[PDB]
Design a protein around this ligand. Structure first.
Ligand code: QQ4
Ligand code: U9U
Ligand code: MN
Ligand code: MN
Length: 180
């Protein structure tokens, strides 16, 4: 079953981002052939974390998302026994060396309020920072500390809205929005 969402994701995202998404889905027992909306979601999430790490300075962020489970953990432990930060209960996305805290990036289709409420209740470990983006343009972070500057986050929102426009122009946005 070859879907339109799959071919659009392959045409829309970076080949390496696509490959990393495929590796993650297959590692967690999911099929990008049929789990197409999830495939698109993890592609957007990967690109957003990569642009996020692109912001800031040179040695600012350590990248956890993208790495496979065991190695991503290994880096989390290295960072913990180096800086002395509480080991998070679940795998985060990045680590800020300048602010000395883990970062859980979030990309949501609906209201940022609901999404951050859910992920903050599911995290509980209030040490790690939370930064939520949305396709419609909103963003919201812990303590209103949006970590990066305004221009990088504006870039991220522009990319998200471009992806949303492409999905809508291919008659694929409605199935994507009702997926989360
Ligand atoms: C370092 C290597 C791979 C990196 C990949 C990651 C993504 C980066 C790609 C670069 C090229 N840019 C920048 C301009 C456009 C582009 O395409 N960006 C950022 C924007 C979107 C994107 O794609 N980055 C960040 C540092 C440089 C680099 O390449 N990754 C993958 C996950 C972990 C990691 O560090 N590593 C490290 C070891 C394993 C591996 O494969
Ligand atoms: O880290 C993450 N997953 C880590 C494990 C994983 C990675 C890739 N594929 C499957 C598993 C992660 N996942 C999501 C979206 C999500 C939320 C709840 C359950 C499942 C998923 C999805 F779609 F990924 F399967 N939003 C984030 O912001 C985020 O950080
Ligand atoms: Mn993650
Ligand atoms: Mn995340």
């Amino acid at each position: 079953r070859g879907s339109h969402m799959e071919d659009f994701v392959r045409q829309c995202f970076n080949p390496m981002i696509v490959e990393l998404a495929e590796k993650a889905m297959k590692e967690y027992g999911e099929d990008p052939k049929i789990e197409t909306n999830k495939f698109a979601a993890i592609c957007t999430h990967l690109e957003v974390c990569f642009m996020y790490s692109d912001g800031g300075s040179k040695h600012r962020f350590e990248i956890i998302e993208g790495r496979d489970r065991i190695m991503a953990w290994t880096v989390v432990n290295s960072i913990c026994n180096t800086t002395g930060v509480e080991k998070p209960k679940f795998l985060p996305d990045l680590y800020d060396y300048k602010e000395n805290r883990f970062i859980e990036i979030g990309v949501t289709r609906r209201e940022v309020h609901i999404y951050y409420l859910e992920k903050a209740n599911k995290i509980k470990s209030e040490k790690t920072h939370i930064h939520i983006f949305s396709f419609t343009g909103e963003e919201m972070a812990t303590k209103a500390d949006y970590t990066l500057d305004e221009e990088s986050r504006a870039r991220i929102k522009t990319r998200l809205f471009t992806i949303r426009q492409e999905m809508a122009s291919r008659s694929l946005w409605d199935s994507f929005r009702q997926s989360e």
